[PDB]
Amino acid sequence: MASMSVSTASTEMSVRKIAAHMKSNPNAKVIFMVGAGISTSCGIPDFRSPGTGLYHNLARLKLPYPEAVFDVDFFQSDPLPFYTLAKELYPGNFRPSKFHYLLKLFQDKDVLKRVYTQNIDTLERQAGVKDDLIIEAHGSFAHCHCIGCGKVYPPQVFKSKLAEHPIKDFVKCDVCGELVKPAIVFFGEDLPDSFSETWLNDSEWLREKITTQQPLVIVVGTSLAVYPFASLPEEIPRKVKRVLCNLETVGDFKANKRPTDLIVHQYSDEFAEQLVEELGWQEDFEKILTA
């Protein structure tokens, strides 16, 4: 849970600007858009990184390249690599980070409009963020369905297969016989309707607040390299302040910077620490963290 700054440079002044904006607009809410960066401190292994036990197990299993684990065609031809990744990444194996708890604090303070996440770890929900405020753009393991006929299956059927040694006899649909898989969006598949639908509604909400207070969209720990999720930032209203907390400037913040863009090069957990400080909520935060 302990963090430190990424470099000798201080980001407290930049983080202070954010707290100042929220101070001047006490009845405004914030929309977060997050990626893998906010869960790195949780110890979740990056399947694309050698030196991770997961990477080598997938390589030993003949996975051709990391992302084939999230490819429909590959899964149907050989589901073992995905099952192996699921065993290691299944929700419940990790604990939320300081940044995940920040989302909870904001909710408690009624300043959370929505959190759009590309992650499948569901640590936002595990941390106590309400279902209504979360948009898991790439799905999660909480639901399962047959890839052929769409029949619904309880998530526990899939989960029970992961505890077997070795993992074999994968879940097959008792209607059409095809493989059943967790509701995780694989490369090549459309995201769930709720993604576009909610962004449609939040986009109007954003544009309408510009004319009344002022909202704020904060992008954290994402390389903005996966679409359509990566299109959100450019679609934020020109008149709505965009904030980016990432080790490096990426996506629209790099391709089309905006005068009002606030860029903060900092670890998501350190950022959380500094924001809570500048907001004066250290007391409530500590309570949540110790709860």
Binding site: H138, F187, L191, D193, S196, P228
Partner: peptide, 7 residues
């Protein structure tokens, strides 16, 4: 909607 998940 935006299309299918991709790079």
């Amino acid at each position: 909607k935006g299309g299918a998940k991709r790079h």
